Amino acid sequence: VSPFHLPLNHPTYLIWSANTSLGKTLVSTGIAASFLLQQSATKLLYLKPIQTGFPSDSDSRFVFSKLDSLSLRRQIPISISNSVLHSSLPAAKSLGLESGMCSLNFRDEKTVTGAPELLCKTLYAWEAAISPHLAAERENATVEDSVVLQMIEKCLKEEMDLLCLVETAGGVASPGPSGTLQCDLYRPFRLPGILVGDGRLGGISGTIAAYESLKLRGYDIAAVVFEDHGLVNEVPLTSYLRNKVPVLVLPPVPKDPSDDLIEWFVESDGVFKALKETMVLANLERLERLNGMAKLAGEVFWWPYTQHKLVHQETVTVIDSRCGENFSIYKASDNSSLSQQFDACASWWTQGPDPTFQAELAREMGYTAARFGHVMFPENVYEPALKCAELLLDGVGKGWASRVYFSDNGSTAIEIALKMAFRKFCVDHNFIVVKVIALRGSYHGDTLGAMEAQAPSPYTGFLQQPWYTGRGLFLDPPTVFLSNGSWNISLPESFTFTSRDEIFDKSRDASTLARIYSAYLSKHAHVGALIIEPVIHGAGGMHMVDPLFQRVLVNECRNRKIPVIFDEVFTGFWRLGVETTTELLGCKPDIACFAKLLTGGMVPLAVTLATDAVFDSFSGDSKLKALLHGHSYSAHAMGCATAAKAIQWFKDPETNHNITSQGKTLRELWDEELVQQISSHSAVQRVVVIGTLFALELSLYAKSLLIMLREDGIFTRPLGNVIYLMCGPCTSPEICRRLLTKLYKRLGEF
Amino acid sequence: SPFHLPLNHPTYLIWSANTSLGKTLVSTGIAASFLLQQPSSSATKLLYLKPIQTGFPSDSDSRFVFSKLDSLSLRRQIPISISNSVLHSSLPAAKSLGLNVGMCSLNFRDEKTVTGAPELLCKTLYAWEAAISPHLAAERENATVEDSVVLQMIEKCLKEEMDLLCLVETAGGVASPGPSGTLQCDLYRPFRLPGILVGDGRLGGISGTIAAYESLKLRGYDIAAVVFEDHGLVNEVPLTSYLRNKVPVLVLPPVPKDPSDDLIEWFVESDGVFKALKETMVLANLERLERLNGMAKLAGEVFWWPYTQHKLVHQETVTVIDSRCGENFSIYKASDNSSLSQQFDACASWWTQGPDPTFQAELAREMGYTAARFGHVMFPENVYEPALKCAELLLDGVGKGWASRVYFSDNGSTAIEIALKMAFRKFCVDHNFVVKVIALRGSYHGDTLGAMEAQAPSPYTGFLQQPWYTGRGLFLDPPTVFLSNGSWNISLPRDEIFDKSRDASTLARIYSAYLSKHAHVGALIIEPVIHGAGGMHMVDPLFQRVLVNECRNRKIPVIFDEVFTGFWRLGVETTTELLGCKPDIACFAKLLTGGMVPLAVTLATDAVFDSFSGDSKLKALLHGHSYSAHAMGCATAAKAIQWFKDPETNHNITSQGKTLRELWDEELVQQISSHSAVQRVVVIGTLFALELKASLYAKSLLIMLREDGIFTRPLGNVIYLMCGPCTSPEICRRLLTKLYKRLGEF
């Protein structure tokens, strides 16, 4: 349910394995001995989260017993304890002794006060020596992934010189109890690890492949280690890793099964010291980097949209990774800790993926890099660009669009749209100084051309954009807001809904306002293009524009033969609970732009969809009547495959549980009860809520709130007096509800 | 040379998660299912290739398939021809065969022929005696084979045979070193054959199966089916679930454990699973050909391409690209016998192109990992590793002795506009404050309106192409440099050219006067050394060095547009080395990411930065895009920057001087310069261009070069070949030879 805090003061490593029977428990045992036996407050925390084959086999007990033996051999006293916390029923009967689980009281503890401490813990145990996923259901005893991660998070905090080993169960891709592959299960924590390879044969292959399936889940591996079989397996391994990761070779394990193994551990102390130090150096080097990243960023970056004179080192957020909707954020100020923070600005409104879907995309992207890299677009065809165009045409552009034009970002797509619109215009009306018509407050990107479509303001003065001119007729939009339980309208200095759905309703078009609008609008340098930001003015302050007003404006502009541009860079692809705002405005454009969420938040890519007619206006025999706009990476396979995936994933009820019965809409994500309350709060002007967006309007008092929300594990950037939480199309309502609860609690604390 | 693989008939690799999984049993089952049929078509053929084979001759998968099919032919009562060949083996292998003998070719063959019957054709290409790893056997038995030799051998076998099905059985796991030490999966990559994966029913087998699959996927391969042997663990359920049932998982019954069992009845018990597996791979090929065969047409109906007049493009000129491997497109043609073939990307895809096959594969993982670790992570006031690493590499290389700040954008166009805004500030602060830039007519700086304003009026700026253009600059005409008939000459409007001594010379004074002799000019913007889009004209560096010094003397900010030249395009990391002067502002993109993904930087001086400092959040630089500093591009550029730069990874970097070596053959160059149709040749770094004296004549040449496996887009009368920073001179030489040959044929 909630965000984790992982202490980073002490190193904690996963013990991964290419397969089973490679030595994994032997490796934990060697690390521990190397660390506990030297010449006080020294502690090795050994966790075997999942354990099958219990109780006849028990890696906790193995480590436990083997260290007791080594402590005598090496003549260095230590304390030791082994615990097992839970097991299925059949496991607990084997010892003599819910979700189908049993708690246990099982502990051994040969204590020796003041001596280095060994602390072994098995968290959950089953009986059959099979994959955890089979045991879970055969013994009708299971554990949820988050429960497993909470259990471990609890153990870590409970203990934090110090070292922690978390031993996996099976290969890197073995299903855990719930069927979730082991490598996806531990991903939220993103712990560094070591991989126990295979010295055998086919072992080079199995080792490289396990390593790759880890890498491609975002993990770091401090060392690969394996058991000598006389094949010199280490040479191809070291070469593949370009010797950036050390490969350690343990001597052959005795084959005689009655072997205590004591002398082998002694023979191997060298390799185990080396392995222990590598994971000690690796952590130290990682902390030194983390601890210097804020400062160095302040000296080396020039950030967009930030007045550097004002940013002080303490406000530079250090992000170490992301897992779905959560940043993993480093704080030195704590006990040096990585913790989760919900990305509530959705990172410049790009954000979409689930943890599940993030992992999926990563492979889809790896594969696309390896198959295509970047491949020249003009006059060419390759699969991911073709697939993407087909998905765009058959969804977002279903009943109007017939051509797809690729660019790099929202800004380029918009400029491409402006050029197309002015042609369909200078061809129907034969052609001249051209201006657009827009709604003051709409935002359309930062390149000069997209800048000209925005109304004069401070952001357009001579200092911010020297070549600005303001090439448009900017009308002031009526807006819609939610206050004290009901949706109102707020007309411009010129000029109560039951529910939010009434607003978007077709019957509303025959009403009074529709006439009042048609006149005020009709009543208005040649206007050669209509450009709107459908339903919502994003950058402008999360104002919901009256859809009726824009539906009417569109129909007017088309009646007078003016091309209509829908700027859906912000709204497109489930941001607002639909694939296209076309569905909400009830009218179609001639031109439309998409980006941001098009790639599901992973990589830049922009499309400008066009009508068959808009296209024809660029047809002729002169290569000069063509559209001469293009960038080097236009239609890059990377972004295209990524968009082709995201489009289908966001859309499919199988993969996106937020998708409804009808397939055309997201279920309501933000709690109705809370939404009322936050809007009826003596500090809120208005609330705008729809799809994945929740915003409110109230200076300082807002920056107070943010400081407070950061404390709750919610990162968010304010739009002046507008505070917004924005999730992804796949984010669960339970997550959103928690967001609103935290906002509401902090909101009363003034 | 470039390969041509027939695609008329399906050819699949047989990959394995490990060894001892059944691999040879799977080939054997496919072949039986395919050869033993009711049609008994005389022209039915299964080509079985075991390219690499160790443990020879006591074990021999060719012989296994061979013998086991003979057996099944009797059992199933359907006659067939069969033959087993071994083409090469180490010495120790050949002695084991008696043959009274560091590779050598054997005549060894057995061929129980039965005319008119379905044909089995088994071929082992290279064999080692020792039952050890191929990379170990190769050196222990002083007998090796180059990767390209192995691929040529296979290409030769395929052409020699192409109803029909072809199985190529791997040796070991997907990542087992081949004879040369190259991992098996990287070895077959250039061919990019589809395949099936033989998984592991055992235990740890789900893990090993997923991981083998993933190391395949992450080398760009497609897998039609996963198949494995039942061990009672129901391994197939997690597998099917991970693949979201988009790839079928087939489960064979347990193989008999008794070692003397001839397995005949198991193959019979398994015919169901083997039919299924044979159909899946026959259908995956059919579905792949249907797609391929409809891509050009559909592209014509669905795309709106940049820079192309659609009325003129016909279906027949739409190039179908199926993949790329380093510098080579793999291009589909139905006009052939439906064939995938290699074409050198000589336009470097809009001048973005860099990676080696080796480096392409490397970047792919680097990117997979970055997607999985970061996705996209909010930039302003934040820090994450790949962006920090990238900025450090930029500052310490490309901006070493002048730059102190790095600003991220999406492409060249956005970087340039960002640069323009920065320059006008350092200007409107030194001179206290209508602003125009000063540029060289012909320089190109991107297609967004602001970058458009820095380009001199032309047809591409008329009211139809850009309605809001204005031409906000003073455009001077550049002196150029060309190579003609063996010598470099100047055209007023090779090491000697870039030399510092040349600055004290005549021209330097003549230049200093004309430029000094020239609405407020508030920024200098050049495309250093080469005007790319403009026609691959080399601008006299002395002329630009002088212009820069002139503009700095009058307190005008200098912008270097290095989006095209940056990062080894022209044989150096920065044209700063070549011009011998430093900017205040510079833009990078295209090759910055090593040709993989968009990303742009605008490097700035400490001073240019300071002009945006104050207490008002309005004096800040208010330009930014949603994906600014995306971890994807950043990690990718952080890699590329180091890889292109390092003699260890880039063999074109000369080991002692740590610069790029010369790539374009001396002779062939003069020969094209001497040619009479050629006006000029410009050559430097990874670039070779020429202008003809007559554009039909250029389009004629391209048609002809495509025929030679060289794809390239013309700049009117300028024809250019452009390789990557890592491309071998041997490859380049071949390019020049083909251009020269076609150049005489007029």
Ligand SMILES: *Cc1c(COP(=O)(O)O)cnc(C)c1O
């Ligand atoms: C973000 C946005 C753009 C521009 O996108 P970038 O990729 O940041 O240039 C244009 N229009 C709208 C409505 C947007 O939200």
Ligand SMILES: *Cc1c(COP(=O)(O)O)cnc(C)c1O
């Ligand atoms: C390609 C290029 C640009 C612009 O790059 P895009 O990413 O295509 O916008 C700017 N200047 C020069 C010299 C270039 O070559």
